Amino acid sequence: MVTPREPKKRTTRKKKDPNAPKRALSAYMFFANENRDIVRSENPDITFGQVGKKLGEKWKALTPEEKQPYEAKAQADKKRYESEKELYNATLA
Numbered sequence: 001m002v003t004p005r006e007p008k009k010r011t012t013r014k015k016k017d018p019n020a021p022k023r024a025l026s027a028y029m030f031f032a033n034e035n036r037d038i039v040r041s042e043n044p045d046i047t048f049g050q051v052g053k054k055l056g057e058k059w060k061a062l063t064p065e066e067k068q069p070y071e072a073k074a075q076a077d078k079k080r081y082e083s084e085k086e087l088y089n090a091t092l093a
Helices: 027-042 048-060 064-092
Strands: none
Touching: 027 048, 027 064
């Protein structure tokens, strides 16, 4: 029932287009994307209800000296995602 208004069962020519954001990621998403596999690999039986909590407790307790690069990476990816999106909205105006 998503949007009762359906323009002739979707009548678009070119839906997918270049220069498009890919959703940035936070320092937690990076350390969680990798750690989520380390735990899921050592224990695929447990779901994200424990895997994500494992990366959250490890990262949260992860010395700031090691997180330095992590958060910094999220900032570099935060500008890349916000940069591409800004260009799109600025190109369509």
